[PDB]
Symmetry: none
Subunit: 147 residues, 4 copies
């Protein structure tokens, strides 16, 4: 019924596609980041933030797609069809999860607005000609500047 997953949080699908698709880290680096930082809270019987609620659902959505990739690997007899189904899940469906996991993990770590301004800032930077922009790409950091 035309739902935007980011609209609830103050973003859009268009705003996350304003960053290159290859910018977002892999699926496993994001799952290991959520499991390192957030695992105790994700497994809690508490809502915590709406980011936790959304992030719990995305991790479970991906687990069912990995069960699908496993199911395809065994059941389907011909390798030609197995590989087109597994490659679609890991790349095409993976990209939309990579954006969604990156978004909520970043909004938990760095704050939600910080991620929204970063996401506008980085996208303008990548479209600015190199001579007229700051030389180094934007990045998010929790490490305070020594002063």
């Amino acid at each position: 019924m035309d739902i935007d997953p980011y609209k609830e949080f103050g973003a859009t699908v268009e705003l996350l596609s304003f960053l290159p698709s290859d910018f977002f880290p892999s699926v496993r680096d994001l799952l290991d980041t959520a499991s390192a930082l957030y695992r105790e809270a994700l497994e809690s019987p508490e809502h915590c933030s709406p980011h936790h609620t959304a992030l719990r659902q995305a991790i479970l959505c991906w687990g069912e797609l990995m069960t699908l990739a496993t199911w395809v690997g065994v059941n389907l007899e011909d390798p030609a069809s197995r590989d087109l189904v597994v490659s679609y899940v890991n790349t095409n469906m993976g990209l939309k999860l990579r954006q969604l996991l990156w978004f909520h993990i970043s909004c938990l770590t760095f704050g939600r607005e910080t991620v929204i301004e970063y996401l506008v800032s980085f996208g303008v930077w990548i479209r600015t000609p190199p001579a007229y922009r700051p030389p180094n790409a934007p990045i998010l950091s929790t490490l305070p500047e020594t002063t």
Copy 2:
């Protein structure tokens, strides 16, 4: 990460296992009900509650599987290998999502503590052997079966 989806909301996967697998209505009837009632909140840019956030994720999860089910139909030329995947998505992967839509649609309606007491009460009814089991099961309602106005 285990991540029981129901644990956040006061239930478990084992608590929703009191319901048979064939208890849950079709995904189509559940999406119709979410649209008929909750659409304008689900398209809304607020956090209305955690159930809304969970539906918004479950409805987009199902939308991606239908994009998959449509993508596989075009891009798999081998019919036998195509019909197995299109089925597995509509039936096997549908069941868990069809159980998850039922839960959050039932909690927005009827209240959440009523759905948890329904699962307990329905479990007593379904565990009862058929000889001793009453003819009418527990059911979620805001009104008695006969409404005189």
Copy 3:
């Protein structure tokens, strides 16, 4: 009527004429920037500011030139002809749009006073011969020169 696009906004064609062609992002990058940022304000039934009014007209102006560039591809037989027409639209006419889109997008994000002060200081830098000027052009950006968003 001799009308200056920039003069109601506090600039001129001459003030923006010092920016080189390679300064501006492409048309696609500027359209996507206005869309990713200002789309709901650009599509709202309100006057948000004169920069919004001016973007709405520039965006639809480019939409007509792309309808032209598509019409030329379909209805012109001569391949040498359809190439000179499509290139003139994308290169020469698009360059004037890139300048116009960049200006209003920048004045929405940084404010018009900041953009005008940037254009004054950029001209001093660009008019200086290369030997006598700092090797890096002035930068107009939201980032504190080190990036590293923090907060």
Copy 4:
């Protein structure tokens, strides 16, 4: 994206579609009216109203198409392809600026709201079957 040009001002493309294409005056007649009445304001270094801003943009859009049409004449040797492009700009592309020039010149002259009821009133007239249709169409007039 979408960007209805008229929705900012209280109209739409659906509402200006009540007017036929051949209703609108020529670009020349519209530019002569803007130059007569509005030129000192259009060339002013200030925002008079959003209709001035939008009308400045449309006059500059038409000027770039006339630079195009002048350019296409010189730099296209094949006359068969040359006149197709020139006749497309002066006719097909000019038609949509005719609508946009007409709309803002009318809202500066007669008022924004007056042009909105004129579009409604002209639609009632143009939809009336010919037998019952009054012989004179609605027209914008500042005479009280």
